[PDB]
Symmetry: D2
Subunit: 393 residues, 4 copies
């Protein structure tokens, strides 16, 4: 074994895979990072040697994007990954590939807003029936499967309610039923939970959130457990032209290296903040998978590795008015905006940042429902700011 070779028969440990996975020094120059292939087209040597060097057009595939895809397939435990302009585009590509008119698709009722909206507002017009059910109980899913069900789409934890789905149990049901199991583990990251290890057929990620974790790029990823699934997604990406760009792939290859340490820090910070809010006289409920009153504590302890994540939610006593005063008074370092998973701590109120009382209520997004993405700042500053805002609420 020489410098540049890995030791044979060794599987690199996890953090090493985050640092190096799917990437070796440039063969041509030894460049330690992958060069950015900011180019549209790739010259062919001859008609007979078409694609011999593996590339022809970046809408189809691109060397930088491919390096990122390989690293992501390694980190998530999948056969192959496909990288997309956004997480919404990865989601939409799954829905586009595996559903046809007359098909049934069970979706967690607490899915990300955008996922729900793309299902109801758009894909339903193709006479695809999306049924949104409670995924907390796996028997609910098992018995909601119909003969037209082709896809079961789980999310865990859920955006923003933080409800968990038992991925292993649902995967068990879907295998027995011969149904595709797709799971959106954006809130979890592979550091906390890898649905493909838990039996999922497909994982969808918004790399915008934690993969990036820097509020820098948009991106999506579809990680497939088999070559058939992977090739289907690959084909449809080429057709829908929603592939990720080389520059975004570079950014994400760079930010993935620190995902484990980032998520550890965010999660410790979030554990402390959730405990603080748990004791606060102005706070009505606190949802965080790591505090002992979490209603799905057992599933969390079963399913979450290392951490319980950077996301939490709470409710301020007083209702919408108090929540709004609180939001309007949360100071820096906090940011009042959308997105999550970033180094920068973010706070938002999903119910004021278009629908009706009863929907957001049945969903769990109450009127004072504040969603919180914890970053890597000093937790004492973050709690100072929350405490101030709360005294103002």
């Amino acid at each position: 074994v020489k410098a540049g070779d890995w030791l044979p028969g060794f599987t690199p440990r996890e953090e090493t895979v985050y640092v190096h996975g799917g990437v070796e020094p440039d063969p041509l120059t030894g460049a330690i990072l992958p060069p950015i292939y900011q180019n549209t087209t790739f010259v062919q040597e001859s008609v007979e040697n078409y694609l011999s060097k593996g590339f022809s057009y970046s809408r189809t595939s691109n060397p930088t994007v491919l390096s990122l895809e390989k690293k992501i397939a390694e980190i998530e435990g999948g056969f192959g990954a496909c990288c997309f302009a956004t997480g919404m585009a990865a989601t939409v590509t799954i829905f586009s590939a595996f559903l046809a008119p007359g098909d049934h698709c069970l979706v967690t009722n607490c899915s990300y807003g955008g996922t729900n909206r793309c299902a109801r507002l758009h894909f339903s017009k193709y006479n695809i029936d999306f049924e949104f059910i409670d995924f907390r109980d796996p028997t609910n899913v098992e018995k909601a499967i119909r003969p037209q069900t082709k896809v079961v789409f789980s999310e865990s934890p859920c955006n923003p309610t933080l409800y968990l789905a038992d991925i292993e149990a649902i995967s068990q049901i879907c295998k027995e039923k011969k149904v595709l199991h797709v799971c959106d583990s954006t809130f979890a990251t592979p550091y906390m939970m890898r649905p493909l290890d838990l039996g999922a057929d497909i994982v969808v990620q918004s790399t915008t959130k934690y993969y990036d974790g820097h509020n820098c790029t948009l991106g999506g990823a579809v990680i497939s457990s088999t070559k058939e699934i992977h090739d289907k997604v690959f084909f449809l990406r080429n057709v829908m032209g929603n592939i990720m760009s080389a520059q975004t792939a570079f950014y994400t290859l760079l930010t993935l290296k620190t995902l484990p340490i980032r998520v550890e820090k965010q999660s410790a910070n979030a554990q402390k903040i959730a405990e603080f809010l748990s004791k606060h006289h102005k706070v009505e409920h606190v949802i965080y998978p790591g505090i002992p009153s979490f209603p799905q504590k057992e599933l969390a302890l079963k399913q979450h590795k290392n951490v319980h994540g950077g996301m939490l939610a709470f409710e301020v006593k007083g209702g919408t008015e108090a929540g709004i005063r609180m939001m309007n008074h949360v100071p820096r370092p906090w940011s009042l905006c959308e997105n999550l998973g970033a180094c920068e701590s973010i706070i938002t109120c999903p119910a004021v940042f278009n629908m009706l009382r009863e929907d957001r209520l049945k969903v769990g997004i109450t009127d004072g429902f504040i969603r919180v993405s914890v970053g890597i700042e000093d937790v004492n500053d973050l709690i100072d700011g929350l405490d101030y805002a709360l005294s103002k609420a």
Copy 2:
């Protein structure tokens, strides 16, 4: 009127719009170029001031992408534009927005391969009927329109045959029929043909090609004639997650500035190369709108402005094997690859299928993208290559 203002009541001339349309110096700093908003989210000042600064999340809209969209809307003469990760995503978004199960869509039979394939192989599974017809006679279009027809999709010039479609007549037909006319004018560029000026309801562009013209970025654009259409596209883009990145948009804002002079040069070179090939004994036919042998020269002279474009095609005597030997022996500066519209001259023979000769792509059919190299190097390379055919 002081420094930094456009004169009220005056309209910039064409090239000025390419340089400056949709962009002003940065209000905060005066930066002559718009900064790159390489950021995903935008901080809101309060709950009630939500969106007061115009942005929330870059998947929905981004300032750099918006400046490019304003430029493109100005260049193509439309109400609004939306920018996409690719031309194929733009096309797909039109299909997704304006078709439903049971609808009918007429598509030019000589469309870009990708368009034909996403229609026939994906959207057709939603029980959408795509009919491919010959758009060279607008009477065909008029006769083929059904009551379920929602979209007529033209492309002019066509890839790779360079067939032309009469955008104005087709638009009058669709207006009378209240059907949406979408035109893919990627091969023309707005510098030679603007379908919105000719009555098209929507324009689709692969900005990858000429807008970029540098082999650098991928991109797509949908330019909408009306606010209703543009709002629909915008909403669907947000739902599809196929918006263009801010970095890409910065690149394209940069490269658009030289589109007029780039296309002037490419078309000069293309005219010269077409005349050269028109005389070569190894060459069966030459297709370029700028030579008298062009079948649709009347429509060409009516519809094309400034130039006849950087794209041409030609047939080499001897069929597929001849074309292949030529390709294998085309020297630099030519590049054998995909893509078109670049400063780098590109040659390809898409053949290397009885529906090919129905789509007009024959055995020795060679599509040629003329760049801005010295035309003598390009012609000398072509002449050598042909000596090996």
Copy 3:
């Protein structure tokens, strides 16, 4: 000869060199554009194979920067090129390499402000004597050469007066005198004049201006006629750590492709604008190498190929007050700012955008002296805006 080879024994024509010079498809993937080597360090195969792949540290050299350097050396007719963070850094590196205390350096008295300032304010403290003389007459230079003269630094055309220097004649003198001839041909571009073809030893370029021509990047280049000179510059760049970045190199590799067509359009526009101003009753003098009253018309016709450039200057009747009203009233498309050579037409007043009357007068930068960089907009818009501003002056 196969696809990917050039025809043997052919020298590619000029515009072809701008499009392709110093760049071939990526050997590894066939990528038509050079990949961006956004990386600091390059992995070595072994101790004995150190530098075998040619790179180790991007402060010293970088593959993207090297591609740009090769293209630039081709376009300018030099042995080798060295690319720098800015044009000021290239200039400073020349001054740093070839002057020592006690040395004499003749500089054109109408050099770029920054060049003059770095000479007087900084390098003079090393007891280097910079003598600034009129370069319009080559005999002035010949007879101003002293035994301590090591460097003759010409600029042509000059920023902003547009004075020309007879590069061939000065090169002749410097050869006979055994003195280094450096020429800053930023205003000219190699499309109009290549001092290395005219006998210069070194060419300095601010690639910020026309190489870029898009107001996008900063950059500098030093093109050396011999390997000795080139290696000296290379060493000193590594030591002073002012190399250009891979990303800026990519941008410039991309913008160089259109330099010929850009400069043709800018120059036609500038010829028209200079004629218009030549006829304008509010304009006192107009300087443009292309109009028939240019005082150095003969040298211009001798020395300029294809074009007379995008730069012009004029003076408004009325003095500083009229000039200021005019500047304050020039509308878009014009931009009131610094820089030049860009697609965007730019106007500025060097004498109000810190010194004294008599210096700016002896220099030629009069009080109403407006410098104009013409872009590629529609010339009718540009003349409309100038005419408006002038009616306002």
Copy 4:
């Protein structure tokens, strides 16, 4: 105090400054990250409003670079910071600004190679006398100060020996002597040592190393304790044309956010690797501030905060050939290259010169940059490599 404001009278804690220092949401859009001002010039509103928006030309200053400079000034506790294309340009600019013919400058004898070489081989031709001495005893510094001495240049820890300099004592010596103290704390990072807090007049940083920590960018920074010093540096940077690019500054603004957790991890790994090597029979000596065998452990415990850093060094028994065989057989995840401070673990043996052993770099001297990989992979690779020594 509403959303978007810092509480008046409060000072952010350390890690918060790494995330947020010197940056606010974009006033125009609310963009949570500052846009990239990839532009050369800035449009002025009028002749008299010249510079009213703060910018004119990116060689002189640029908004992205300025936001990074504000962050860095906050992190290092200085009046101001200027950013440069590289660490070497920062060092060079200090030498250019503060030395003149006939001046004297004391420089640590175990400085980074580049610093020693730009002094001995370039600036010495301006009749500037550079004296290289042993900074481990501040009495040496005090005794070596001449009336022509203008700059004392310390570096702590030193590259590659990891010698420490007592920044506080040296600063007191230079204060009494009214000589400028510049400290290159590149190896320490402000997370472990901030020389400005210890009395240094100037800090120089290669942001290439830990500030970046990703092997991505080159960069330098000069942090000035006073406005006089900072204005001098700024003026000279404008004259030298060696400012940092806006894109680089964007990258570094990004990577700085994780510097604390990166360095925490690297130093944990480094402590474990040093303890491992301290026990290996093939290893002569191990140099890491965090083990009891460290000669300057008292100064280490006094001057280092939080961690003892990601850098270590060690000597392999058998000399140069042993070190070389080890290097040739260090496996992945290790990278054999230059640079340090990255998430990617890097190893090198700078030897492959009687002044080497005067500068303390022996035959089997191996400098090691510990990244954030799993320490077991790193130790296993080192153990194999050593089995081949």
